[PDB]
């Protein structure tokens, strides 16, 4: 009965359900408590079609269940797979945007402002990830999460803010769709933005749907 399960649960139990949700712009990362039925109702989408899509994906076995992994292992994975990867992706994308805005400034379809908006995202992310790595994650590792509800809600507010900056980047790039005039840098950059959105959503999902709720529950 997938329509009745929360998005976050579905994304964690069905391999690549996250990619299905991305296609429909369903926020499983910050909106993970919503039922699929609700999220579908909000978007005016046929849930039965989405349920069939999920059933086909569930045919693949699941590769690794983060729902049961120890919190310290989740944290080290976040740092290596997501935090450090964002520290490399974003500056690359900023450089590519700088060049595109420079060279194609006079094309009517150029994504004007993209360099600044990627830089804003990068700046918010850098300070956010440092708070996590230096202050919050160490306390969660020592089993102190159930006394950290204040801090954790602050981090979830910051995840929501990063979500808003993603929407701005989407808006500036026509939902990350290159015009017919785009060169290979411009196309590659848009592919990299999509990759960044994928990773960021999986990163935030892992924190909002697994790490933080388990830590608050006393792990």
Residues engaged in binding Zn ion (CB under 5 A): 132, 207
Instruction: Give whichever of 129 and 182 is closer to ligand O, judged by the CB atom.
Output: 129
Among ligand O, Zn ion, none, the one that 94 touches (CB under a kind-dependent 5 to 8 A) is none
Among ligand O, Zn ion, none, the one that 86 touches (CB under a kind-dependent 5 to 8 A) is none
In the numeric block, which tokens belong to residue 5?
């399960």
Among Zn ion, ligand O, none, the one that 104 touches (CB under a kind-dependent 5 to 8 A) is none
Instruction: Give whichever of 97 and 129 is closer to Zn ion, judged by the CB atom.
Output: 129
- Supply the minimum distance, in Å, between the C-beta of residue 73 and ligand O: 17
- Supply the minimum distance, in Å, between the C-beta of residue 132 and ligand O: 5
Integer Cα distance of 85 and 49 in angstroms: 34
Residues 6 or more apart from 21 whose CB is under 8 A from it?
7, 10, 11, 27, 28
Residues 6 or more apart from 114 whose CB is under 8 A from it?
97, 100, 101, 169, 172, 173
What is the CB neighbour count within 10 angstroms for residue 112?
12
Among ligand O, Zn ion, none, the one that 214 touches (CB under a kind-dependent 5 to 8 A) is none
Instruction: Give whichever of 53 and 133 is closer to ligand O, judged by the CB atom.
Output: 133
Residues at the contact surface with ligand O, assessed by CB under 6 A: 128-129, 132, 203, 207
- Supply the minimum distance, in Å, between the C-beta of residue 86 and ligand O: 9
Task: Judge contact between 145 and 219, C-beta under 8 A.
Answer: yes
Task: Judge contact between 192 and 92, C-beta under 8 A.
Answer: yes
């Amino acid at each position: 009965a997938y329509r009745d399960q929360p998005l976050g649960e579905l994304a964690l139990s069905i391999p690549r359900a996250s990619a299905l949700f991305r296609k429909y712009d369903m926020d499983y990362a910050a909106g993970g408590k919503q039922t699929l039925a609700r999220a579908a109702a909000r978007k005016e989408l046929d849930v039965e079609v989405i349920e069939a899509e999920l059933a086909k994906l569930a045919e693949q076995p699941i590769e690794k269940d983060w729902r049961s992994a120890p919190l310290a292992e989740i944290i080290d994975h976040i740092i290596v797979r997501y935090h450090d990867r964002h520290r490399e992706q974003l500056p690359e994308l900023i450089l590519q945007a700088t060049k595109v805005e420079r060279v194609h400034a006079d094309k009517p379809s150029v994504p004007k402002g993209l360099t600044k908006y990627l830089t804003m995202l990068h700046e918010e992310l850098s300070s956010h990830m440092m708070k996590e790595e230096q202050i919050l994650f160490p306390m969660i590792k020592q089993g102190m999460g159930s006394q950290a509800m204040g801090p954790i809600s602050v981090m979830e507010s910051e995840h929501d803010e990063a979500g808003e900056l993603l929407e701005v980047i989407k808006h500036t790039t026509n939902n990350v769709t290159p015009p017919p005039e785009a060169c290979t840098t411009w196309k590659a950059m848009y592919n990299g933005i999509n990759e960044l959105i994928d990773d960021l959503m999986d990163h935030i999902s892992l924190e909002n749907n697994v790490l933080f709720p388990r830590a608050l529950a006393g792990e």
